[PDB]
Amino acid sequence: KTKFHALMQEQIHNEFTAAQQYVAIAVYFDSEDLPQLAKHFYSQAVEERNHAMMLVQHLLDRDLRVEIPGVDTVRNQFDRPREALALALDQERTVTDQVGRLTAVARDEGDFLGEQFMQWFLQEQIEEVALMATLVRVADRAGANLFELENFVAREVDVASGAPHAAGGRLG
Amino acid sequence: KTKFHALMQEQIHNEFTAAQQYVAIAVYFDSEDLPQLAKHFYSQAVEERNHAMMLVQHLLDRDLRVEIPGVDTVRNQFDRPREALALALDQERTVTDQVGRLTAVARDEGDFLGEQFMQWFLQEQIEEVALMATLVRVADRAGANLFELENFVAREVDGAPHAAGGRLG
Amino acid sequence: KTKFHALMQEQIHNEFTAAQQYVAIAVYFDSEDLPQLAKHFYSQAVEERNHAMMLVQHLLDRDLRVEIPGVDTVRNQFDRPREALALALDQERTVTDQVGRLTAVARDEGDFLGEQFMQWFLQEQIEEVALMATLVRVADRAGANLFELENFVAREVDSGAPHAAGGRLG
Amino acid sequence: KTKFHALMQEQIHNEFTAAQQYVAIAVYFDSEDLPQLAKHFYSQAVEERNHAMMLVQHLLDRDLRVEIPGVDTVRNQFDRPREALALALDQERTVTDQVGRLTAVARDEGDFLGEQFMQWFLQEQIEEVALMATLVRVADRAGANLFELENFVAREVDAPHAAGGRLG
Amino acid sequence: KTKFHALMQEQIHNEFTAAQQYVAIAVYFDSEDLPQLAKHFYSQAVEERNHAMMLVQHLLDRDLRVEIPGVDTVRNQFDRPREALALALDQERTVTDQVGRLTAVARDEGDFLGEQFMQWFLQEQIEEVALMATLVRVADRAGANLFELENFVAREVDAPHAAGGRLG
Amino acid sequence: KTKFHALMQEQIHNEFTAAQQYVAIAVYFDSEDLPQLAKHFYSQAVEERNHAMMLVQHLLDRDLRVEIPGVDTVRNQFDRPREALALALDQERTVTDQVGRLTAVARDEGDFLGEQFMQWFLQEQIEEVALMATLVRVADRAGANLFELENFVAREVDSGAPHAAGGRLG
């Protein structure tokens, strides 16, 4: 078993866990009656699931063994919205590290196929982190006037022939 | 914390796990190059996620605490397609029991809202079990000419409470 | 063999027989030259057949043995339309009883699947009885001026239903 | 009561029974997970009901007494699909005989209206028997590969007034 | 007179009174120049009227005597919007209890028709309480900036036969 | 509190009660299986509610206090249709008097806004009374056949209006 292969298997687990964490954050917001934030995070959980499934599909394409893993417990309690957003930013930053390490490991093993495959993920991370950071600054500026944060999301947020195929198709 | 509330929380965990198990089965089929079976199980995983999210939505609606749980490890290794279909059938039968027990518990506690909410799930389980049982009998009849099972799926296999986050296709 | 399962098998028989009884009533009306009544009862016979086929489908879905039964003789002779409408009302009340007893029996055996499946039939019975009752009161008011009853049917008369085996017929 | 009238009343009974037998066969196939065969037999049962109602209509048209009868028990158990198809073929052959005899009897009593009315049923029988026979030969050739029989049905298997209108 | 029947008659009265209470709240909001809240409650009053009329229709369908009742006085004075929303939430919770008790009573008398008929009202209550609870929390968060509550309603906010048809 | 203002408040009560009385009549008809009559009275109850809500709107527009009132018990028992129609006619005549008196009272107090606002209601009463009177004469003539009264309603019985609080319902 190569390291890239082992590390990809870990990343599938990390991605499924990340997606579950977004669902928890979506449901937190929902229960706080912040529907624009909730709708955004429900959507973000579906996209992380898609990333996970792109990693599965890569191993499938290469005839490398792949396990659909279990998922670790995720955080459900937040003192307030800014704390959930902060967690989401931190998570995207963590994923950025993981993806960079996947690249480095493939480079080091001369796994050229793995290396090129990681490139799309690096670009996505650029923009995902940029978005989470934006949501954190805006939540900070909004303070307890959460309505402004909601208004910002409704207007400014969410309004790639490139992507790798996701096993089972890319969900909306 | 009522028993119905505790048991709903368990069910959400059971459903997310069931959904993960379907993804495993979908991926097994995909690796076996049985795309029609794979596509069907990917779709079934999305629906189970939906059921999970309908349970979440019910607790939300009632202002009862709800936790999005972790997910237990699921089975990835099968000797052959029929074995994965058998596991799916057994799973749907298990979910049917769990749903019956949720209803019973709500009846016993006089939770009339919980009881009526379970009804839709009972109907769905009727048809989901019938479908899984059909796939198993057809897989048996197809023996190792799996192509016939694929053809059957392509040709013959093609209201609800709100799901938190909306019902996914 | 559970009691619910046995009782569902009887109900299938009862529904096929109910459907045959509506055909006899439709034909009686047809022969009396009351085409609006006749058309409505032909339609009602198709719907009862559909109910029977929904019960069949339920057993099929659950892998429980199901027999397509024979049908008992039904009534063909009526002194007059009001007597046929009265028979139809009584029949729908009888079916209501049967459906309630199926529900009770499933509750009593903890057959949760069976119980939920009966619910749709209970709401249908509510409206079917209301309609038969209406036709009887209107026939009573019309007396021998059956034309008014025909006029009433032409002007005034006519979901998540469970799957019917073979599809729901019009 | 003429013999043609009596025999028409029997035929109405025979046809209601035949229709119920097709439903039994349709449900057998359905439970065996043979949906193409099932769908075809559900459809066949509706058409036999239609035939029965055409007979009812004919007596109605002639002001001859007509009873909607009860229906005899029908067969629900089959060892296998071929056995159900064989039963259906035999049944259509039996109906052909019955229809021939209705014709003969009307000829013999000088019931010209009855005789002409039977002619349509004679032509229908020709094709219905041909179809049942075809399904039996194809089921024989398919042996236990019932999927081929289903495939055949999906691809190759696509009037006097009926009291109450002709049902689809 | 069964208890279920007597209790349905009371529920018709309760529903008419509930509907009139929503009109009072709608008019309160209107006078406060909170048109989004007012429009929502006007629409809510029409829906409660619809519920009332579904209960009437059920008794009609069953040939059980039904009276269109009078309506009790309802509350018109509120110190502020959150107090009117609170009353609406309380009222929806109360209706939920009433509906549960209607179900229990029908179960206890073996009134299977009445029991199945109450089921739809249970599901509606689930969502109607969730919505009122949502409006109360949002009004709390908005405090005196009622404009935010209005903006929230404008953007985020918005069956058995009813005697006389379901009104919009 | 002016007399016009007080009397408008009473009128809002009278209108809500009138609307409730039409629902009672509609339901009586419905239970008698006279659907055309029933449909017409359901519709008439919705219109009276509208009138009520136009009065509410007028007080809203003028910043005068307005209470949504309770509703008095109304009549549910009728020996026969003609008796319910008679009650509706008498009710519309009573409302006509009430509206006249509101106008008079506004004239007497120099309430020019109230006076002009009452005018539309006077015109409506003209036609509503004419229609109720028509239904009564037709019901009298159709004593042997009430289906004729139904037929008449289906065929012969299906403006610059003031805003109704909450909008005018159909």
Contacts of residues C98-104 at CB distance under 8 Å and 24 or more positions apart, as own/partner, are C98/C11, C98/C14, C99/C11, C99/C125, C99/E112, C100/E110, C100/E112, C100/E113, C101/C7, C102/C4, C102/C7, C102/C8, C102/C11, C103/E112, C104/E110, C104/E112
* A61 vs A48: CA distance, rounded Å: 20
Q: How far apart are CA B68 and CA D160, in angstroms?
A: 65
Task: Tell me the C-alpha distance between B26 and B7, whole Å.
Answer: 28
Q: What is the 3-state secondary structure of chain B?
A: CCHHHHHHHHHHHHHHHHHHHHHHHHHHHHHCCCHHHHHHHHHHHHHHHHHHHHHHHHHHHCCCCCCCCCECCCCCCCCCHHHHHHHHHHHHHHHHHHHHHHHHHHHHCCCHHHHHHHHHHHHHHHHHHHHHHHHHHHHHHHCCCHHHHHHHHHHHCCCCCCCCCCCCC
Find, among C134, C128, C149, C151, the residue nearest to C81 by Cα: C149
- Give the burial class of B79: count Cβ atoms within 10 A of its Cβ; 0-12 exposed, 13-18 middle, 19 or more buried: exposed
A71 touches chain B (CB under 8 A): yes
For chain F, list the domains and their CATH numbers: 1-170 (1.20.1260.10)
Integer Cα distance of D130 and A5 in angstroms: 62
Q: What residue has token string 């996620």? A: B49
Q: Whole-angstrom Cα distance, residue F117 to residue C102?
A: 62
Gap between the terminal Cα atoms of chain E? 34
For residue C6, give both structure tokens. 């046995």
Q: Which of B152, B151, B169 is nearest to B160 (CA)?
A: B169
Chain B environment of C60 (Cβ under 8 Å): 130
Closest of D6, D7, D38 to residue D24, by C-alpha? D38
- Measured distance CA(E110)–CA(E106) in Å, rounded: 6
Q: What are the backbone angles phi and psi of residue A170, rounded to the nearest 5°?
A: -75, 115
Distance CA C35, CA C51 (A): 24
- Please answer yes or no on whether F60 and E24 come within 8 Å at the CB atom: no
Tell me which chains share at least 3 CB pairs under 8 Å with chain D: B, C
> A171 with A42: CB under 8 angstroms?
no
Cβ C112 vs Cβ C60: under 8 Å: no
CA atoms within a 13 Å half-sphere pointing along the CA-CB vector of A59: 24
* H-run or E-run covering D158: none
Give residue D140's identity as a one-letter amino acid code: D
Cβ-based contacts of C138 with chain F (< 8 Å) = 33
The answer to whether F64 contacts chain E (CB < 8 Å) is no
Neighbouring CB atoms inside 10 A of C154's CB total 14
* Whether B99 contacts chain C with CB within 8 A: yes
Structure letter (DSSP) for residue C33: T
Indicate contact of C with B: 3+ CB pairs under 8 A. Answer: yes
Q: Cβ of A25: how many Cβ atoms within 10 Å?
A: 29
What distance in Å separates the CA atoms of residue F132 and residue F129, rounded to the nearest whole number?
Answer: 5
In this structure, are residues D54 and D76 in contact, taking their beta carbons and an 8 Å threshold? no
Q: Which residues of B are annotated as a binding site for Fe cation?
A: 15, 48, 51, 92, 125
Amino acid at F116: Q
Comparing CB atoms, the residue among D20, D23, D163 nearest residue C30 is D163
F31 at the C interface (CB within 8 A)?
no
| Six-digit token string for B157 | 């296999």
- Indicate the residue type of E163: A
Chain E residues inside the 8 Å CB shell of C119: 116, 119
CA–CA gap between residue E46 and residue E54 (Å, rounded):
12
Residue of chain E minimizing CA distance to B60? E130
* E51, E60, F35 from E162: Cα distances, Å: 7, 11, 14
Query: Please, which residues have CB within 8 angstroms of residue E47's CB and are 6 or more apart in sequence?
Result: none
Neighbour subunits, B (≥3 Cβ pairs < 8 A): A, C, D, E
Q: Which residue has the tokens 């795309």?
A: B35
CA atoms of D3 and D9, how far apart (whole Å): 10
**What is the spatial distance between Cα E24 and Cα E48, in angstroms, rounded to a whole number?**
13
In E109-142, alpha helices (H): 112-142
Alpha carbon D150 to its chain's center:
21
The whole-angstrom separation of Cα B40 and Cα B51 is 17
Asked if A168 and B42 come within 8 Å (Cβ–Cβ), the reply is: yes
- Integer Cα distance of A87 and A93 in angstroms: 10
Which residues of E line the annotated binding site for Fe cation?
A: 15, 48, 51, 92, 125
Q: Is E26 helix (H, G, I), strand (E, B) or coil?
A: helix
* C148: nearest CB among F32, F147, F154: F147
| E5 to chain C, closest Cα gap in Å | 15
Judge contact between E86 and E27, C-beta under 8 A: no
**How many of the other CB atoms lie within 10 Å of CB of D140?**
12
C-alpha closest to that of F90 among F33, F51, F135:
F135
Question: Which is nearest to C104 in space by CA: A21, E106, F28, E159?
Answer: E106
Asked whether the beta carbons of F26 and F81 are under 8 A apart, the reply is: no
Q: Identify whether the C-beta of residue E75 lies closer than 8 Å to the C-beta of residue E24.
A: yes
Q: Do B165 and A31 touch (CB under 8 A)?
A: no
Q: Does E119 touch chain B (CB under 8 A)?
A: yes
On the CB side of B88, CA atoms within 13 Å amount to 35
Chain E touched by F160 (CB under 8 Å): no
List Cβ neighbours of E118 (8 Å cut-off, separation of 6 or more). E99, E102, E103, E106
3-state secondary structure of C71: strand
How wide is the angle at C-alpha E89 spanned by C-alphas E85 and E94, nearest 5°? 145
Experimental method: X-ray
> For residue A71, what are the β-bridge partners?
B71
The rounded distance, in Å, linking the Cα atoms of D5 and A103 is 90
Cβ distance E96 to B113 less than 8 Å, yes or no, reads yes
Question: For E62-111, where are the alpha helices, taking DSSP H only?
Answer: 81-108
Min CA distance, C77 vs chain E (Å)?
28
Which of A17, A68, A75, A158 to mutate against chain B (most B CBs within 10 Å)? A68
Task: Identify whether the C-beta of residue F77 lies closer than 8 Å to the C-beta of residue F37.
Answer: no
Residue B78, token pair as written in the block: 């099968």
- Cα-Cα end-to-end distance for chain D: 34
Q: Which positions ≥6 away from A19 have C-beta within 8 Å?
A: A45, A46, A48, A49, A52
**Torsion sign, CA atoms D7, D13, D16, D22:** negative
Question: How far is CA E114 from each of CA A6, E18, E51, E62, E163, rounded to the nearest angstrom?
Answer: 61, 21, 15, 10, 17
Whole-number Å distance between alpha carbons of E22 and D142: 70
**Around Cβ C12, how many Cβ atoms within 10 Å?**
22
d(CA E98, CA B112): 11
* Three-state DSSP string of chain A: CCHHHHHHHHHHHHHHHHHHHHHHHHHHHHHCCCHHHHHHHHHHHHHHHHHHHHHHHHHHHHCCCCCCCCECCCCCCCCCHHHHHHHHHHHHHHHHHHHHHHHHHHHHCCCHHHHHHHHHHHHHHHHHHHHHHHHHHHHHHHCCCHHHHHHHHHHHCCCCCCCCCCCCCCCC
Closest to C163 measured CA to CA, from C19, C42, C62: C62
Write out the H or E segment, with its range, that includes residue A164. none
* Adjacent-strand bridge partners of F71: E71
Question: How far is Cα D41 from Cα D29, in angstroms, rounded to an integer?
Answer: 9
Binding residue numbers of F: 15, 48, 51, 92, 125
What's the CA gap between E64 and D48, in Å, rounded? 43
| Residue A168 in contact with partner chain E when CB distance is under 8 A | no
The closest of C24, C61, C65 to C41, measured between CA atoms, is C24
Separation in Å, CA of C160 to nearest CA in chain B = 7
Say how far residue F158 (Cα) sits from the centre of its chain.
17
* Cα-based torsion angle of the residue sequence F147, F150, F155, F159 in order, rounded to the nearest 10 degrees: 170
Closest CA to C153 of C85, C69, C62: C85
d(CA B78, CA B90): 15
Q: What is the largest CA-CA distance in chain E?
A: 53
DSSP state of E3: H
Question: Residue B143 CA to chain centroid, in angstroms?
Answer: 26
* Angle, CA E48 vertex, CA E44 and CA E50 arms, to 5°: 115
Nearest to E116 by CA among D71, C127, D14: C127
Q: List the beta bridge partners of residue A65.
A: none
Which chain D positions have a beta carbon within 8 Å of C23's beta carbon? Answer: 68, 164
Is residue B160 within 8 angstroms of chain C, CB to CB?
Answer: no
CA B62 to the chain's CA centroid: 24
Q: Which two tokens stand for residue F43?
A: 């519709």
Q: Nearest CA to F70 among B43, C58, E58, E17?
A: E17
Q: Which residues of F are annotated as a binding site for Fe cation?
A: 15, 48, 51, 92, 125
Compare all CA atoms of chain F with the CA of C156 and give the residue at the minimum distance. F35
A51 is in an annotated binding site: yes
Q: Cβ contact (<8 Å) for B164 and A42?
A: yes
Q: What does the alpha-carbon distance between residue C58 and residue A144 come to, in Å, rounded to a whole number? A: 55
Other Cβ atoms less than 10 A from the Cβ of A141: the count is 11
D74 vs C74: CB contact, 8 Å cut-off? Answer: no
Q: Among A33, A151, A154, whose Cβ lies nearest the Cβ of E138?
A: A33
* Size of chain C, expressed as the number of residues it contains: 170
Cβ of E164 within 8 Å of Cβ of F23? The answer is yes
E163 touches chain F (CB under 8 A): yes
Euclidean distance between CA atoms B30 and A57, whole angstroms: 9
Is the Cα torsion angle D48, D53, D58, D63 positive or negative in sign? positive
Half-sphere exposure of F64 (CA within 13 A, CB side): 18
Length of chain A in terms of residues written: 172
What is the spatial distance between Cα E95 and Cα E121, in angstroms, rounded to a whole number?
Answer: 10
B61 and E96 within 8 Å at the Cβ level: the answer is: no
**Do E19 and E48 contact (CB within 8 A), yes or no?**
yes
Rounded distance, CA F20 to CA F36, Å?
19
Alpha-carbon distance of A82 to A137, in angstroms, equals 9
d(CA E26, CA E81): 11
Phi then psi for F30, rounded to 5 degrees? -60, -45
The answer to whether C37 touches C150, Cβ cutoff 8 Å, is: yes
Contact of C24 with chain D, judged by CB distance below 8 Å, is answered with yes
d(CA F11, CA E21): 19
CA–CA separation, D45 and E33 (whole Å): 66
Chains A and B touch (3+ CB pairs under 8 A): yes
Cα–Cα distance for residue pair D125/A136, rounded to 1 Å: 78
* F146 vs C: CB within 8 A: yes
| Burial class, E108, CB count within 10 angstroms (exposed 0-12 / middle 13-18 / buried 19+) | exposed
DSSP single-letter state for residue F63: T
Residues 6+ away with beta carbon under 8 Å from C155: F154
What is the CA D140 to chain-centroid distance, rounded? Answer: 22
Query: For residue E52, what are the contacts with CB-CB under 8 A and spacing of at least 6?
Result: E12, E15, E16, E19
Residues 6+ apart with CB under 8 A from D39: C166, D26
Partnered with residue C71 across adjacent β-strands are D71
CB A33 within 8 A of CB E137: yes
State whether residue D164 sits within 8 Å of chain B by CB. no
For B13, the token pair is 């965990």
Confirm or reject contact between E119 and chain C (CB < 8 A): yes
**How many interface pairs between B and E have CB atoms less than 8 angstroms apart?**
31
Classify residue A172 as exposed, middle or buried by CB count within 10 Å of its CB (0-12, 13-18, 19+). Answer: exposed
